[model samples]
Target: VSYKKLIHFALEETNTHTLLSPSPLQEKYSSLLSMDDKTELQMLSFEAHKIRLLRSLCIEGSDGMQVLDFAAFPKPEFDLPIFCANFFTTAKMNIIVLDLNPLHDIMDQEDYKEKYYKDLITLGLKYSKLLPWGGKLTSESLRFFSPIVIWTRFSSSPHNHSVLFSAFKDYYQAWLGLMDRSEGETDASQIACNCEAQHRYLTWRSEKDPGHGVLKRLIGEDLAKDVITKFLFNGVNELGNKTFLDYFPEYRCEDGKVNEKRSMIGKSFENRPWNARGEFIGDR
Candidate 1:
């Protein structure tokens, strides 16, 4: 599978950072059998001292489509960024969003942004133009993203895959470096802050991720819901008590229920927001 190389790269890179142990949830949910039978849904989750959860879902459909959604959540004790690499590929078009998104707000934060991302500005600029910005995503999705985000839409080609592989490798390595230097936080207030931010992100993905529909089509709706709620987004329910409406009340319509669309903000980041210095150039 095309995703095999990327997955292999991540596991090896992560091993160099810390020893990994199989997550308890992996015992029951590791290998999910798809309806096609020929195509298998492989999931791997792990943890270490610094990482709270490192989970990845890689699927290569027999129908010739492939997807890989991999993320690493830092422990609440350490307020590091969450690493995200989401890729969806079909016969013709591909959608990709790869970033080490800050767990806290970076737009209003200079210290936070400078702490983790300022040094990596050059690394981000290297690929900002290589992979163009994906146009007009759901507006609220912007809040979850960072300045280095590589959200792009492209046609499937051997060359494009090569470019993506290179970018993925470098990004994973950078994230590993961040984990290497992090120290646990004993401050209760700061730990709680990290907890809620992570919970908020999980809520956003569980409810609005565009891949949910594609996953349902691959598996049954019932199984897809279980996989997302139980495995992909396991922390959403336990870590924080807030409901979707509570965190994002604007999502509620006149009837007072959450909107089903990907975003209430409406999509419109036609151009990449960061400049070469990793500065925010967009009004969002």
Candidate 2:
């Protein structure tokens, strides 16, 4: 199945819940050419009443490579979890990470986990068996993932594609349900916490996402930087003034620049790390 079908389904599903107005980003980034003329990058962005930004980036290469990065960030007034679905496809294999990534640290705050993910464990378990865990994820990256995250890798097949599509729908609707029930934050301090948490998230992804190299290869380094900092992780600059180093000082270099390496902390969790009760049982 073409990845565009998934894109179509997501946008249409979102529209049913809230009015999606075209975001300012669409004017310039709706469509872009890759270094190879045969490869195309399509970008779509919209903002709803509760959503601060809803964006998708899809790429199709002439060599049968397909990539999709889709996410929804809610307004700081609402401390809802972020909706994230990233998929990478090649001729032989597919890598996928789908989850309603929580806005706060679940380990330190069990209430946050109970509030959002407790009801969704069944949904996660149902898909975990079909998809299974892919491999190790960086300990640093684990902070962004929820207990219900679906991280899986598999060879391409019609059956697998259908199952993935179903999983995407289920996860997406669950996020929308949470968004519908959340009330806007009234206290300034609470709003500040939400704002800073999202900014930290945007900062981390802009600096460390694995897709940057692939994007650079497709569109060149300069444009890829623009696409990442401006379009994909759109709020890295505007959401807050903190640099990646400020949010994650461990990655700071002696020369006062962020380290170029992907993971300073290294990888762990060979299998799914969370248990049925949404507990962090991956400690070795």
Candidate 3:
């Protein structure tokens, strides 16, 4: 499946609603080649009235390895969910995660869940059946996922590809609708909270993303770090002063550094954690 098709559809559909302009990030890292010259990475970024940064990083290798990391982050003024889609595809299998990840913790806050995700519960249910849940994920990682998140792993097949495309369309449309209806939060404290929430998210993912290993191999350590921090998770440094250890103290080392392990807590949730009504059913 050509992930470029998904990217094109997103930009075209978004243009119908708001004016899209190239973000300054495009100039610095629009295109990159892997160290071996056997793979290419295409990066695209844009910004709109409500969107602070809409960016995608797609890596295609000659050996049939394809990876895509795409996300749309709203400005701090609006406490909206971040649109996220990260898919890693190979000849044999594909691992996928597609979600309108809540900026605030829906599990802890009822009003936040009801306000943004109530209308979208049925939509989540529809795709949850088609894609199904992937296996266990760490409790810490699950904190970043919304109740509607589609986390699935499957063998490469035509039917799966078609369904993924449809899911992508439905989810993206749903997110756009939310963006259109939301009014910016005027309360200074609330906006600050939203900003900090997003910064924490960026800090976490930039540090612990599963794709970092593949990225390091493809582009070497230094360049991969730049791509992860500056291009993919752009606001990690600009948005906040906190380090990964600051947000997740569990990973703090004795020497005041972050542990390299992906997860300190073991993985759980062998089944889908969210029920049909978009409620978190996993153990608390």
Candidate 4:
């Protein structure tokens, strides 16, 4: 599958930094099976001081659906961006969302936006035209996405795959550049804020992401739950005790569960929300 090559490229680039230590999750969730033996799920995790958790799940399937859920979470002390790449593929179509997911809200925060993403818009737009948007998505999800997000769906084509690889390489390099210059925050309050912000992000996906269905159907129910809680999002457990509802109270319902609401930004910013300066020029 394409995910194999993608991870290989990313790992090669990432190794230039300090060595990465294997994450504990690799022992239990190292590998898994789909319904039958045709598909094999591969998992690898490692971390460093600046990078709290670096994990990748590459599903080399039986010429069927394939998935790549890879991310790098920065330690709260470093107010750096989190790298995100999620690609789901079937015989007919491919869905992708790749970004240097910001740790703070770039839309409302001008200083923050310009600080990180302002320099990367040119590189981001180079492929934005080819990749296109993935159409209207849930409102809350937009807040997590950066101005240069690559959220698109396309059919399997060799050229499309090549273009995506180019974009991923550039984006990953941009993130590593950010990490290279970031200075660890010493202010206790500021570090705590970053910690909570990242945890809130984990809170939404662990319980609400649409990909969970595909995960459960392929892997067993128990294993899926463990992966969601333990592997995909380890911070949700130890990064403060806030529950999903605690972070997202607006979605609370009469049934004492999330109201099943998806978009909260009124489906704002259908297009890429930035220009050359990486500005958040979305709807008012």
Query: On residues 172-249, what C-alpha lDDT tens digit does candidate 1 reach at each position?
Result: 999899999899999999999999999999998888888999889778899999889778887997899998888999
Off by over 4 Å in 4: 264-269
Which is the winner by lDDT between candidate 2 and candidate 4? 2
TM-score per model over all chains: 0.96, 0.98, 0.98, 0.94
Which of 3 and 4 is ahead in TM-score?
3
Off by over 4 Å in 2: none
| Model 4, position 172: C-alpha lDDT score | 92
Cα-lDDT of candidate 3: 0.91
**What is residue 268's positional error in candidate 3, in angstroms?**
1.0
lDDT tens digits, residue span 143-226, model 2: 899999999999999899899999999999999899889998899999999999999999999989888999998899999999
Ranking, lDDT, top scorer first: 3, 2, 1, 4
| lDDT value, residue 212 of candidate 2 | 90
Tens-place lDDT digits, model 3, residues 1-284 = 88999999999999998999999998898888989888999999999999999999988888888888999999999888999999999988999999999999888779988999999999999999999889898668888898889999999999999999999999999999998898988999988899999999999999989999999998999999999999899999898898888889999889988987788987889998888888778963
Clashing pairs in 4: 138-263, 139-263, 139-264
- Relative to the true structure, candidate 4 reaches a TM of 0.94
Please provide the root mean square deviation of candidate 1 (C-alpha atoms, Å).
Answer: 1.4
